[PDB]
Design a protein around this ligand. Structure first.
Ligand SMILES: C[n+]1cn([C@@H]2O[C@H](COP(=O)(O)OP(=O)(O)OP(=O)(O)OC[C@H]3O[C@@H](n4cnc5c(N)ncnc54)[C@H](O)[C@@H]3O)[C@@H](O)[C@H]2O)c2nc(N)[nH]c(=O)c21
Ligand SMILES: C[n+]1cn([C@@H]2O[C@H](COP(=O)(O)OP(=O)(O)OP(=O)(O)O)[C@@H](O)[C@H]2O)c2nc(N)[nH]c(=O)c21
Ligand SMILES: Nc1ncnc2c1ncn2[C@@H]1O[C@H](CSCC[C@H](N)C(=O)O)[C@@H](O)[C@H]1O
Ligand SMILES: [Cl-]
Ligand SMILES: [Cl-]
Ligand SMILES: [Cl-]
Ligand SMILES: [Cl-]
Ligand SMILES: [Zn+2]
Ligand SMILES: [Zn+2]
Lengths: 299, 118
């Protein structure tokens, strides 16, 4: 019925981002309700399809030989539904690397098994997708405080391995969140908290950083922004919807041939920032992509 | 030599497992697509037509799913990193369909399910 039902999902409105709310318990009217999915379609295929449909409306940089890394890509099924959707969405020839604590079989060019902290690379990336979630998050024993774990690795990976002009989509929930990650959103040309319509009944959202500027554009207090996110979710019920899944005609990410250039930290002027903010520039070298997984040697 | 002589007819074993009433391998990743594709068997992006379902390749490969070596040269997988089209009538068992059927090297269609090079 609602207009947003034909959208892939709903983004946090700007006025909610500007509030100064205190963290409240998340209480969704339809909490737990399951979406009606097309016959035989997995929830994670539907969810990533809606995330990609929403990413098609942003100013993403899409260079030739694009580099994409996907954390938390394995499922309890032993397969990678999200990786299959990203590879369908990304231009042919896009280098796609995925990873998970648990073994799984993937359509990615390379798969690394182990804690994300064991993943290393000197290369910079154009897009970082994370669906990581700690199962222990369900054990809500204390106050809802900023979480460390894989979030400290994701924040460091963005600050050191994300190309300027690059973007990220990091999954959060009411209890799976990190204040520093929200603060990093202020280092992008634009950001939002996006909720898929197939998972409207979950506190889940993807924190999207659009076009990395490598410097703070706006100052964001993470504790306040997560409280603002929960306030938005608690006061704006979203009707479950799978309508956008039925129209895949414009699904593939548009090839923009975005320019790739190498620049010192002193060459980043207002004119360069302007190009980064429109998805027209990626700053990194075009060297060979090399990744590794640290192995702990024991008896 | 002796390790190769012993190895393990996995393709043959799956057909016997189904004949004994075994439940087909599940969790093959079905993709959302227009269903207005070329209908070729193995493609870089989903190409299902109105009579097909498109699936992530790795999830429909017996060797990938069972964590065993591939027969293809140097263990090269033909489904991993690609999308396989499966007739809607056989979409209940994608692993069984890819094993029992073969792709036409000329038109790129499944032999007996799209290939008409005759
Ligand atoms: C938002 N919320 C949270 N809880 C309570 O707080 C706990 C922690 O909350 P959360 O941070 O996990 O958030 P939420 O419950 O919204 O997450 P959800 O289970 O929908 O999971 C979202 C996504 O996380 C991933 N995920 C969840 N659990 C797992 C898991 N075990 N393994 C892997 N991935 C998982 C999946 O991708 C899934 O789609 C919940 O388990 C529940 O007791 C609520 N209770 C009520 N009554 N009403 C609510 O609105 C509510
Ligand atoms: C989606 N988006 C929003 N902005 C900024 O926000 C402005 C418009 O914000 P908006 O796109 O949220 O509002 P609009 O009314 O266009 O549509 P809506 O999304 O349905 O609400 C832009 O002019 C930018 O300043 C964006 N800025 C950049 N760089 N990239 C984006 O993808 C982007
Ligand atoms: N520290 C960590 N390092 C790596 N993976 C982690 C992690 N903490 C959680 N994960 C992974 O996060 C995942 C959340 S479920 C992921 C679902 C997957 N994206 C899909 O397409 O279906 C789990 O597979 C879990 O193993
Ligand atoms: Cl923690
Ligand atoms: Cl920690
Ligand atoms: Cl900084
Ligand atoms: Cl192999
Ligand atoms: Zn295989
Ligand atoms: Zn033929």
């Amino acid at each position: 019925a609602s207009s947003q039902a034909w959208q892939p999902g709903v983004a946090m409105p700007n006025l909610y981002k500007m509030q100064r709310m205190l963290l409240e318990k998340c209480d969704l009217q339809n909490y737990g309700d399951s979406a009606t999915l097309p016959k035989g379609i997995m929830m994670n295929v539907a969810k990533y399809t809606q995330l990609c449909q929403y990413l098609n409306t942003l100013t993403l940089a899409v260079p030739y030989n694009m580099r994409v890394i996907h954390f938390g890509a394995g499922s309890d099924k032993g397969v990678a539904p999200g990786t299959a959707v990203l590879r369908q969405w990304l231009p042919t020839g896009t280098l796609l690397v995925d990873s998970d604590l648990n073994d799984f079989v993937s359509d990615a060019d390379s798969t690394l098994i182990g804690d994300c902290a064991t993943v290393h690379t000197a290369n910079k990336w154009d897009l970082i997708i994370s669906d990581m979630y700690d199962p222990k998050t369900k054990n809500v024993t204390k106050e809802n405080d900023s979480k460390e774990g894989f979030f400290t690795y994701i924040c460091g990976f963005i600050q050191q391995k994300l190309a300027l002009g690059g973007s990220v989509a990091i999954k959060i929930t009411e209890h799976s969140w990190n204040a520093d990650l929200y603060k990093l959103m202020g280092h992008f040309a634009w950001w939002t908290a996006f909720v898929t319509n197939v998972n409207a009944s979950s506190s889940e959202a993807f924190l999207i950083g659009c076009n990395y500027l490598g410097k703070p554009r706006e100052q964001i207090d993470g504790y306040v922004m997560h409280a603002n996110y929960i306030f938005w979710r608690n006061t704006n019920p979203i009707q479950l919807s799978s309508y956008s899944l039925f129209d895949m005609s414009k699904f593939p990410l548009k090839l923009r041939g975005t320019a790739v250039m190498s620049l010192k930290e002193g060459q980043i002027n207002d004119m360069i920032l302007s190009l980064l903010s429109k998805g027209r520039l990626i700053i990194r070298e075009n060297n060979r992509v090399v990744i590794s997984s640290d192995v702990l040697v024991n008896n | 030599s002796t390790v190769l002589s012993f190895c393990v007819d996995a393709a043959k074993a799956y057909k016997d497992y189904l004949a004994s009433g075994g439940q087909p391998i599940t969790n093959c990743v079905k993709m959302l697509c227009t269903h207005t594709g070329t209908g070729q068997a193995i493609t870089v992006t989903p190409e299902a037509n109105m009579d097909q379902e498109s699936f992530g390749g790795a999830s429909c490969c017996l060797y990938c799913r069972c964590h065993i070596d591939h027969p293809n040269p140097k263990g090269f997988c033909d489904l991993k990193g690609k999308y396989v089209q499966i007739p809607t009538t056989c979409a209940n068992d994608p692993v069984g369909f890819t094993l029992k059927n073969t792709v036409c090297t000329v038109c790129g269609m499944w032999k007996g399910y799209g290939c008409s090079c005759d």
